[PDB]
Design an enzyme around this catalytic site. Structure first.
Site, PDB file in Angstrom:
ATOM      1  N   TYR A  53       0.789  -1.224   0.000  1.00  0.00           N
ATOM      2  CA  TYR A  53       0.000   0.000   0.000  1.00  0.00           C
ATOM      3  C   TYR A  53       0.826   1.280   0.000  1.00  0.00           C
ATOM      4  O   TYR A  53       1.675   1.480   0.859  1.00  0.00           O
ATOM      5  CB  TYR A  53      -0.958   0.057   1.196  1.00  0.00           C
ATOM      6  CG  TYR A  53      -1.709   1.371   1.235  1.00  0.00           C
ATOM      7  CD1 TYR A  53      -2.637   1.690   0.243  1.00  0.00           C
ATOM      8  CD2 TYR A  53      -1.425   2.335   2.203  1.00  0.00           C
ATOM      9  CE1 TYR A  53      -3.258   2.936   0.206  1.00  0.00           C
ATOM     10  CE2 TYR A  53      -2.037   3.583   2.179  1.00  0.00           C
ATOM     11  CZ  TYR A  53      -2.951   3.878   1.177  1.00  0.00           C
ATOM     12  OH  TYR A  53      -3.554   5.113   1.134  1.00  0.00           O
ATOM     13  N   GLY A  60      -5.474   5.726  -1.033  1.00  0.00           N
ATOM     14  CA  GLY A  60      -6.870   5.674  -0.651  1.00  0.00           C
ATOM     15  C   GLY A  60      -7.683   4.743  -1.529  1.00  0.00           C
ATOM     16  O   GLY A  60      -7.379   3.555  -1.659  1.00  0.00           O
TER      17      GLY A  60
END
Lengths: 526, 526, 525
Positions: A53, A60
């Site tokens: 991530y 997001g």
């Protein structure tokens, strides 16, 4: 001198020294070591274009977008730029420093996979007076604020010197420093946390406790000026009967503050005065003696005690937060990358809303004590509105009470923010904390209480010489009185009060009256 | 140019011209005449040492104190001094001018028994740029604020020039003006009213309507960018079905704003497209066409309409207040002195709290429209978060949405103040309005909406060129688009957004987009 | 048998006495240092010396001196004139929790009240005679307690099967002889924080169960949607963010999801997504989500924060319960203490914070509901969980509204511990409004059972609509069966109101939590 940001032992007080007193910050060798080794290992995994991530994926909602490691620096760089969208006022220097200090400590803990260079650069800005121009509004709880900070790390954004924002790039050249280049996960880890609300909230809570203390100080003086009972503060009623930590403390600070008073009375004296006054009145007789005083002058331990309890809880949450890995994703050794939400400021979001409430009540009590001495029907023999000359022709403190009364109403219009989540970013951030709104709310009530207490210190001191009771004041009370009088003269005829109040309020925002007691008495306030 | 402050016909707009645009103020001869004659008669009654509140008696609670006429000037003078206890920030120039303008108009009405000299002096400060340094906090609803104003009238207090407070006395000498001397009732009438909240609230409400308009403008553009239905704005649904004044207006401004669009669709076209798309699906078939759009793009007349209704009501109350004798006691001819409470700002206190609420919702709608275009699942074919390049690698407006979402939560923490009365002054002021707190709350939400709308204007304009729909925009929409683009460039790659937003927000706080339509189209917005 | 000794009473104990009619006993010790205290005290009253409430006026009337010969009239006039409570009557368990709190207080020993006072109170509780206590009147708890103090002297009203009946008949109708209030007994009965401390106890005890039931269904949902476990791994809390509450929630989330066949380990996701990527030196679009949304990933943080607030509240309640919150106070050869331990500020703050905490708990539950009902976010499930033809059928589309509505209503509830208003002349110039604080919390807790009720239904529906019942871990199936045993699956759409209220009443009973405990042995924190 110097503070150690090891991501393990940083305290609220330590944060305040770095922020307010410009204390030198120092990242321990074992911390830099933990960082270096973490970077090397993490680099070996990112180097394998594995999905991580915000390192090899969009942010997001756009996490579904995969980015190749060849876009390492661009990825982190677009992030900071596009997220530097803060708006509104810029935080003061001390506030911006607390936030940076909190970030640095987070990363220095070692679970963020940041190069030592970042820890090094942050500490360099703190130790060398390079203060970021951080806009107050933007975080949903703290991307925007931290992004604005992260910008100056790469020679972008603005730094706040002399109160105005100046292009960072320039200041750096004007100092020889060379802008960093954000690598794998470094832009993310710099903004993905609770440092905004945690840094600002530390300052707020630290002062909050100082405000509780100075609140106890003025209250002691007032009690001595109006010669109230000392019974309400007898240790048995708290340490034994109702053992609430904060209640016990306030009670103790009150007993120490008034030790040595000749003006205060003791219940044993009160009843005897009543016993002898009921000499032969009948069965039911109206006296003029009050065996007890109003709540404002007797329930101080309970009320100010609860405020403390709330304040201790907030400091305890902050202590844990300051030394946490407010970041995501997180690296550990010999484990898979942790993909969670430790960036969520709910814990602090709740804490600061409680502080707002607790401080609001602390001001409610102060307000009523003011009303207490200004109302001839409740001041116990003091001239109306502390007018020393001809009332009517002179209003004395009549007008000065209003800003204090209006402030109690203003603090009451500030509602909790930790429950005001609004879903954003394609519903990806369906639940947030708004913690930085909460902390600022608390900062506002804190700032407002100073004004209310200022009016209280002036009234007390005025109450003291009007009644001519200065020789009877305890040592602490005389200290308090002189500190006030050293700033503002006794009120003779009516005069412009605005400056007087704002003068004591400033003395209050810097712990003056708390200092006066420390250098004039042997008292050690809790 | 010049405005006539006759205490009878002053308007909110007129107040704004005096405040914002420095319009010349002028007190009509018939008004000065009414004043002069009133002064002469009132002087003959005060001269008889008769009991008159605040002329021959103490103030507030100390009204029970009788003062001899020989203390005429001292009485009024101690009043202003002792009541100049405001604290906190100083109002901006335009705000302080609105408050003074409102006071002058009150007195100029003729029921205050003030010497023409006072009306003359006030207008002289306005017409000559002498702006009082008025502290924002202090009134219980507006003694403190007005007292600070009244001080400069006698060469005391401070005047705010260049943003800093400078000793009035000095500025006067630096201008040749000679300080006035407060006579019978003149200090009282100068501070005993609602001019603080009425002056500030006029500005707020005037802009509020402007903010409603510019809100309608951006909304029109967005509807055209995403090609929504025009059905929701058909006059029949409002003028006939639900005739709410504001609802009818917003509907009309929307139809005029979009007249000439090639991008918008009409229900008749929508259903035909569905009819032909349901060519032979079955009984129950899933389509991709939406006969209607989300509330955010269809309930604009109802929501923005109600906001207007609230705004019209507030302006109507303000109009009446501006031209009222916000003072006590009051003089009439051939009657006893009126001893009441027309100083009580409750009427405006209620009005401004409603404005706060109405504006808060206006921002809620704007926020959701932003979310609307940034969410690929709701934008009707627009790239996620308006990213024009490679999403993921670029976030586009992803970060810019946060300050807008956070602002909706912040405005929601501002509670009503008109109900927060706290009893003061020996219980004499047992019920107050806090109207100035209410007006400032409204000013805050107003200021915050500008930021939210700014993010909306940038998103719309960005939405327009990304979809390449500029040639289809209506004339008004092209005007709106160019106004935005003249300030901020289209978003190519990600970049620092803070400045862009704050730039459009400023354009918004000065009616730029409302001007763009006035000089580029033939549209007359309600 | 619950020991009411004014020293060790617990929040959970209070509930047992209130909800489960647990029997109460005042220990010989407590009842002993009661008669004793009463003894020395009574020897002070005799000498007719000033003693607030005992030989003086009340509140601002303390200036009025009262000779000992009016001992019974004083206490009685007080209780009757202060019995001015208005509004609804507290529920049986609520009225009970209050009474227990007042006893424990007087059992502390420093109130100097005759032992039969503590005795008679316990009897009322032990025999089912519940006072009819109106909810409004307390400034933080004179009036609420003044109605309780009345039933003791055979006056006012008692609560019989819902309605208020004269204490007179009930007492005679049960073979009990009303009491006569002596020195300081009337004041001691009404001068404390028993209403707010009592009610707060029930609220906090239930709040904690709600946190447990919020976690249960959350886990069900995370399973039914095939979420990641990464977010709950111990290293992220126990190590990286040591917040007690966060740790506890994470632990429960790991225990609840334990042994699930639908959940995905991060490693697997990583390998899954990687496998789905083409090469070059570009940016690709994937349909997989390495991470899930906040509502399904930030549970430990948000719920943990709630827990921390609930833990702190229980803490303050435990201290307050076993405190002498009465006035004035008595000690061994000490002057009669004249303080303000009747001030509920401590609990007023605690409950206001609970109201806030629970409100966020509901926000999170609601968004998870939105999460599963929105096809763009449910990770696969059909729009609004319809089984048949959508559009034609709305499914849970209608059930979501009351959920979203409640979050709004809960948000309209503001702090009460700060709205003090001066009264009684200006004697009570600063109060806490704690009982309002407790009632705000009671309301949000109640509304959260409704929000949760919708979530529990949606969860079951999504389970047997995707067909993943066999992949559900032991705890998940337990929760599922728990729901079906009350409401069947939703085929065509029908009247929802009854199902929702059914699952909401169940939730307020601990039906779930009870199920995981029985059908799994899992010990939830």
């Amino acid at each position: 001198v110097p503070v150690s940001v090891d991501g393990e032992t940083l305290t609220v007080e330590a944060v305040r020294r770095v922020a307010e007193e410009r204390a030198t910050v120092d990242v321990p060798a074992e911390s830099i070591a933990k960082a270096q080794k973490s970077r090397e290992i993490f680099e070996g995994i990112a180097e394998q274009n594995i999905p991580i991530y915000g390192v090899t994926t969009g942010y997001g909602e756009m996490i579904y977008m995969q980015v190749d490691k060849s876009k390492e620096v661009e990825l982190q760089t677009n992030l900071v730029r596009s997220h530097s969208a803060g708006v509104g006022p810029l935080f003061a220097e001390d506030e911006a420093r607390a936030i940076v200090a909190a970030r640095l400590n987070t990363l220095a803990k070692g679970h963020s996979a940041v190069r030592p260079i970042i820890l090094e650069r942050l500490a360099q800005y703190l130790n060398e007076g390079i203060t970021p121009a951080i806009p107050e509004i933007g975080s949903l709880g703290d991307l925007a604020p931290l992004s604005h900070v992260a910008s100056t790390l790469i020679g972008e954004g603005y730094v706040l010197r002399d109160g105005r924002p100046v292009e960072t790039a320039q200041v750096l050249a004007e100092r020889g420093i060379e802008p960093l280049e954000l690598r794998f996960k470094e832009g993310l880890a710099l903004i993905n946390g609770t440092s905004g609300m945690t840094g600002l909230g530390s300052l707020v809570v630290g002062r909050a406790l100082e405000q509780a203390q100075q609140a106890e100080i003025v209250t002691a003086l007032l009690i001595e000026a109006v010669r109230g009972s000392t019974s309400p503060f007898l240790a048995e009623g708290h340490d034994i009967a109702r053992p609430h930590e904060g209640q016990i403390d306030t009670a103790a600070n009150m007993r120490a503050l008034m030790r040595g008073s000749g003006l205060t009375v003791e219940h044993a004296d009160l009843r005897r005065e009543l016993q002898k006054d009921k000499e032969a009145g009948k069965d039911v007789q109206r006296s003029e003696i009050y065996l007890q005083k109003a709540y404002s002058l007797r329930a101080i331990p309970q009320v100010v005690g609860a405020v403390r309890d709330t304040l201790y809880h907030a400091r305890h949450k902050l202590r844990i937060e300051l030394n946490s890995a407010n970041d995501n994703p997180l690296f550990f050794e010999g484990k898979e990358i942790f993909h969670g939400a430790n960036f969520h400021g709910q814990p602090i979001a709740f804490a600061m809303d409680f502080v707002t409430i607790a401080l609001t009540q602390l001001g409610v009590l102060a307000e009523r004590q003011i009303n207490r001495v200004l109302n001839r029907h409740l001041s116990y023999g003091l001239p109306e509105f502390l007018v020393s000359g001809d009332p009517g022709l002179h209003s004395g403190f009549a007008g000065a009470q209003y800003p204090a009364t209006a402030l109690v109403a203003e603090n009451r219009t500030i509602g909790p923010a930790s429950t005001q989540s609004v879903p954003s970013n394609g519903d990806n951030q369906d639940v947030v904390s708004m913690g930085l709104i909460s902390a600022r709310n608390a900062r506002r009530v804190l700032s407002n209480n100073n004004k209310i207490l200022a009016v209280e210190y002036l009234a007390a001191a005025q109450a003291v010489d009007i009644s001519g009771r200065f020789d009877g004041l305890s040592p602490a009370a005389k200290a308090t009185y002189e500190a006030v009088r050293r700033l503002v003269p006794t009120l003779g005829v009516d005069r412009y009060m605005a400056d007087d109040i704002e003068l004591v309020a400033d003395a209050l925002s810097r712990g003056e009256f708390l200092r006066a007691i420390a250098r004039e008495t042997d008292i050690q306030l809790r």
